[PDB]
Design a protein around this ligand. Structure first.
Ligand code: HEM
Ligand code: E93
Length: 409
């Protein structure tokens, strides 16, 4: 057996509020790459089936992610942990967003929404995001010190979402408020947030925006999404509203935490930080994502019996892909535990395994990371941390709530 405590759960929020279970992930990769992770009664993060299969190897993650005909996202959602007492109804509302849909409903939705993540559309965000990144850094440096997460990591990913959706300036304040109130409620610091409230307001704003853009068409990404194409396909108003609700999560706390941990990695590896400031290599973004793995894990449900790397997975059983483990697989990376911002190629699964659900925002994310870290180098090159970062209590998100930091040194 793999050497692990009894009653160990890799989706336990208690661990991730403290640390990442890196030694435990390494143990499984070596001794039990696919491992039944049982869960005590009542302690199933919202799922009362007794446990799941841990998936720790990159190739195993990639097999599951491409075989979405077997490994469903609809059946139980992809989030592997909620509050233990969460109602089944609240899990199943996730199916209203593309992420938790299967083919063919996902296939139709992904093809329409692809019209918003063309390389061309993302490039029109470059200039506005670059200028904001620069001012965010200058504003942060001028403060001398403070919470790096709030002052450097927080704002720009939200600007990318708002700029992509063309949200007018005056509306961005409440849009950021709602977007930031969607996850993390298992952490004591956010016990009082109601995601369903903010989501219903997000959908209302998103649907009103889509009604208005129909009446007054433009050359935005919104109007391309709600008016029909060759096949007569388009998002109806509520579907656009579920698209916005998804964007408010999928591209917010993820890029946020990659910026933070990416800076956390440059503190720990001064060699890489000195190198970065000199060459500003855009390969850093991928290494920063591999290092940060903002989504520790996503799950699937096997719709039929399936044999994966010599392990019989039974219909209805859950498999949880631990991207945190896959991104440090010794069989795929030379030195996984070397932060190397020049690593090329870099086949990390930070954006998920390739397949139907592979992150549509991967290139926007990489651009956001590259702009903000260029701005950090321009305005805050001698960044020194004050105190140790404060981790987020979450079973699937690898979050940093706060990080006290001096920008002058
Ligand atoms: C910056 C770090 C990011 C990380 C680590 C990340 C990670 C992921 C992962 C793991 C998936 C699921 C992969 C799979 O199931 O195969 C995903 C899907 C998705 N991501 Fe991201 N993401 C990031 C940024 C973004 C951004 C900036 C956006 C949009 C502005 C975005 C939008 C989406 C959407 C819409 C999906 C659903 C795709 C589908 O189900 O067809 N993500 N992301
Ligand atoms: C209106 C229907 O949608 C929602 O309420 C909703 C969508 C959603 C998406 C993510 C997500 C996470 C990671 N990468 C992409 C998307 C996370 C949470 C989400 N919730 C709220 C949940 C909290 C408990 C109830 C469900």
């Amino acid at each position: 057996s793999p050497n692990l405590p009894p009653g160990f759960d890799f989706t336990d929020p208690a661990i991730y509020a403290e640390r990442l279970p890196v030694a435990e992930f390494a143990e499984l990769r070596s001794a039990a790459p696919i491992w039944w992770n049982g869960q005590d009664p009542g302690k199933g993060g919202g799922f009362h089936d007794g446990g799941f299969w841990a998936i720790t190897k990159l190739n195993d993650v990639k097999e599951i992610s491409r075989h979405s005909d077997v490994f469903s996202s609809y059946e139980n959602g992809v989030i592997p942990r909620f509050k233990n007492d969460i109602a089944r109804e609240d899990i199943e509302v996730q199916r209203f967003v593309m992420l938790n849909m299967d083919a063919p409903h996902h296939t139709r939705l992904r093809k329409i929404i692809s019209r918003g993540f063309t390389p061309r559309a993302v490039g029109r965000l470059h200039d506005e995001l670059q200028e904001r990144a620069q001012a965010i850094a200058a504003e942060a440096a001028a403060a001398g010190s403070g919470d790096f997460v709030e002052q450097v990591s927080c704002e720009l990913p939200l600007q990318a979402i708002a700029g992509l959706l063309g949200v007018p300036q005056e509306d961005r304040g409440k849009l950021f408020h709602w977007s930031n109130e969607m996850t993390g409620n298992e952490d004591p610091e956010y016990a009082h947030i109601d995601p369903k409230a903010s989501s219903a307001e997000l959908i209302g704003y998103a649907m009103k925006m889509a009604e208005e853009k129909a009446k007054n068409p433009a050359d935005d990404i919104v109007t391309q999404l709600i008016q029909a194409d060759i096949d007569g396909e388009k998002l109806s108003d509520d579907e656009f509203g579920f698209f916005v609700v998804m964007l408010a999560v999928a591209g917010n706390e993820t890029t946020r935490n990659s910026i933070t941990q990416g800076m956390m990695a440059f503190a720990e590896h001064p060699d890489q930080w000195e190198l970065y400031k000199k060459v500003r290599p855009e390969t850093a973004a991928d290494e920063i994502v591999r290092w940060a793995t903002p989504v520790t894990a996503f799950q699937r449900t096997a719709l039929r019996d399936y044999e994966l790397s010599g392990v019989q997975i039974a219909a209805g059983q859950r498999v949880v892909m631990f991207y945190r483990s896959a991104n440090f697989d010794e069989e795929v990376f030379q030195d996984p535990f070397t932060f190397n911002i020049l690593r090329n190629p870099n086949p990390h699964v930070g954006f998920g395994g390739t397949g139907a659900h592979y992150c549509i925002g991967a290139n926007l994310a990489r651009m956001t990371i590259n702009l903000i870290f260029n701005a950090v180098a321009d305005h805050m090159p001698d960044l020194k941390p004050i105190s140790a970062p404060e981790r987020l209590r979450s079973g699937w998100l690898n979050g940093i709530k706060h990080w006290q930091v001096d920008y002058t040194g």
